[PDB]
């Protein structure tokens, strides 16, 4: 997801992260085994440095792994 | 119920018809304080039409003061105080005033059948 401007209102250095997506991370609200999105199997997000560590750790315990990390600017 | 009837009634016979079932209902339920149960009695037509009509104003005052509380009336003035009420306010208030009086509350105030502590 291309950042339109700095996403986050609270301010710090922002770093784009691209993740392969587990079904669990973005379960669809559907009967039977949940399925992550068809279009995005690689959700890309802009995160503040402070939140970076939490985001990454949550990503890590979920099945999906960081494809790449890029600074957001 | 058995006791309540006796103490507030003359000890006069009470027929099953006479007994008010709606007040008796609610005791099992809760939601009626026993002092409030006793209020329902006497607010009853049963007591007013009989034990109130026949006797003179003075008579029922003494008999209330007996039925609701053991004491007979200590002084002329306090009997007079209720007599002021007769016209001053509705009868229901005056009887309500007795159970609302302090000593009714002080002894056997709540959750207690009145007794002839006299």
């Amino acid at each position: 997801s291309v950042l339109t401007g700095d996403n986050q209102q609270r301010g710090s250095k922002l770093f784009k992260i691209t993740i392969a997506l587990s079904p669990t991370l973005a379960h669809h609200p559907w009967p039977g085994l949940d399925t992550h999105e068809p279009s995005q199997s690689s959700y890309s997000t802009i995160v503040s440095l402070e939140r970076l560590l939490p985001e990454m750790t949550r990503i890590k315990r979920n099945g999906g792994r960081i494809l790449e990390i890029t600074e957001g600017e | 119920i058995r006791a309540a009837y006796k103490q507030l009634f003359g000890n006069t016979y009470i027929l099953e018809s006479e007994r008010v079932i709606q007040a008796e209902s609610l005791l099992r339920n809760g939601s009626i304080s026993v002092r409030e149960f006793i209020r329902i009695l006497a607010k009853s037509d049963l007591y007013k039409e009989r034990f109130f009509r026949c006797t003179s104003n003075n008579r029922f005052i003494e008999l209330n003061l007996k039925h609701l509380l053991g004491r007979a009336p200590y002084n002329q003035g306090e009997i007079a105080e209720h007599l002021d009420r007769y016209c001053q306010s509705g009868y229901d208030a005056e009887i309500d005033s007795y159970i609302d009086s302090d000593e009714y509350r002080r002894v056997f105030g709540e959750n207690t059948v009145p007794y002839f502590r006299g």
Binding site: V2, L3, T4, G5, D6, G11, E73 | -
Partner: protein
Amino acid sequence: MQDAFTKAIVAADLRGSFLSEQELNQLTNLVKESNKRLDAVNAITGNAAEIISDAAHKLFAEQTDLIRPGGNAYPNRRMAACLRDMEIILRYVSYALLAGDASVLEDRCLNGLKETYVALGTPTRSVARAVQLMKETAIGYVNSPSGVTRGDCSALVNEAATYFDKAAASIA
């Protein structure tokens, strides 16, 4: 975030030194201008609605197609966006103007703006145009107010311009 003061600090920090006396004198004088600085901002904020309204009229008189079916400003929905956007940009610019620094503007606002516009199919050119239109109107007020002590605001006026322009450029 950042602003004029903080900035100078940061620089000093990396050298590992106390602020040079010379450098203080930048800030000392900056303070003196405050009053001027403030009024400038006040003027913008006071006229905000208008500035935009105005700029828009002119924008649409020029590029008729934007408002025609198939254009980018059509229909209502889109139009609305376009107005909102202009405003935003303005808002930021103001912020900067107060801070005495581009940063805030660049970071929160301008960064990624171009790309957005591109992805949407919004014509970046026209956006830029609008920004300028705004610029001129805005300056108009900054520079011609009522009840203010008469004096020279040029210094501030130009800095204002620059901000507008950084905007224009990075969008374009």
